[PDB]
Amino acid sequence: WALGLLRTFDAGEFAGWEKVGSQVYKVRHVHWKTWLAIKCSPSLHVDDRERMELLEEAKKMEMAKFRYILPVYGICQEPVGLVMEYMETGSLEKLLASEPLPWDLRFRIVHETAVGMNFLHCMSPPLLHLNLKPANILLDAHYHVKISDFGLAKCNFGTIAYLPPERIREKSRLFDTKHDVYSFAIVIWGVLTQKKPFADEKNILHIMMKVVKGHRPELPPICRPRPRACASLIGLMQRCWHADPQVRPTFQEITSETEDLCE
Numbered sequence: 001w002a003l004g005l006l007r008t009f010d011a012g013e014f015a016g017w018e019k020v021g022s023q024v025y026k027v028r029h030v031h032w033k034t035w036l037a038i039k040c041s042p043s044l045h046v047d048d049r050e051r052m053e054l055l056e057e058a059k060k061m062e063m064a065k066f067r068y069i070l071p072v073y074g075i076c077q078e079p080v081g082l083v084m085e086y087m088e089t090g091s092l093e094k095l096l097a098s099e100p101l102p103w104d105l106r107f108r109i110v111h112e113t114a115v116g117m118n119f120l121h122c123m124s125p126p127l128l129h130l131n132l133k134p135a136n137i138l139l140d141a142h143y144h145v146k147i148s149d150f151g152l153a154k155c156n157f158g159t160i161a162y163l164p165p166e167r168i169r170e171k172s173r174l175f176d177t178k179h180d181v182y183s184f185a186i187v188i189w190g191v192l193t194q195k196k197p198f199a200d201e202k203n204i205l206h207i208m209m210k211v212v213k214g215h216r217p218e219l220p221p222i223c224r225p226r227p228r229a230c231a232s233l234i235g236l237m238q239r240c241w242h243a244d245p246q247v248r249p250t251f252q253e254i255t256s257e258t259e260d261l262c263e
């Protein structure tokens with residue numbers, strides 16, 4: 001059902017190719033008189049593993065069409081690329097590095113992210129994102145969230161930070177919803193601090209092992225402008241990164257809590 005509504009694009013349809021990635025381009029679609037985004041494959045050869053995986057990525061984005069999930073329009077062949085809605089503000093990662101953000105916006109970003117993740121986990125069967133980090137949380141012109149980057153999702157280096165400890169303890173464990181919950185904990189931490197996690201520490205491997213034994217990013221202090229809400233968010237964050245997956249809350253329980261923070 002997913003591959004049906006998608007379109008094949010041709011590069012002549014696009015103009016004004018302008019790098020936004022980190023490769024991703026903002027392109028004008030001339031006939032539609034609107035801008036779109038296209039994520040082009042890095043590889044030198046137009047490989048058949050990729051062309052099917054980019055389709056998978058697109059197909060999974062269409063299955064989770066929702067307010068807080070990036071819309072997807074289809075595929076380009078001429079350059080192999082995934083075609084999708086353009087988000088004017090860009091990534092959360094970029095926003096956290098740009099300037100201090102008002103607290104009420106921080107709580108809204110967190111909530112909206114939680115709402116979208118809840119939507120994925122409520123599908124039948126659940127859809128695990130497995131790559132939730134600020135670089136894949138996109139923000140529209142009005143700073144509303146749309147989750148993106150479904151390359152690793154399953155219907156069954158920055159990344160070590162977002163990796164759950166059970167994924168380091170066990171070779172080849174079954175992916176579950178509790179993976180996404182841990183990663184979300186590390187997303188909250190970044191929103192609280194506006195820092196990248198472990199950006200100080202040099203021995204990546206040493207930190208890995210410490211994490212297996214319950215070590216996490218340093219807790220931020222309670223902020224002056226919204227100390228009640230901030231304390232509540234820090235507390236939620238901590239339950240979300242618990243070492244035991246089964247103790248971590250569900251996104252159903254999380255969204256209930258983050259909604260109260262937005263008042």
Ligand SMILES: Nc1ncnc2c1ncn2[C@@H]1O[C@H](COP(=O)(O)OP(=O)(O)OP(=O)(O)O)[C@@H](O)[C@H]1O
Pocket residue numbers: 020021022023024037039070084085086087088090091094135136138148149150151152
């Ligand atoms: N729709 C979009 N609108 C605007 N900027 C985008 C969009 N999609 C991605 N970007 C930007 O480009 C970056 C590329 O991220 P994206 O996850 O899409 O590609 P990727 O990480 O290379 O993918 P993959 O994991 O499949 O190799 C984002 O972090 C963001 O800064």
Ligand SMILES: [Cl-]
Pocket residue numbers: 225226227228229230
């Ligand atoms: Cl408060």
Ligand SMILES: [Mg+2]
Pocket residue numbers: 135136149
């Ligand atoms: Mg990405």
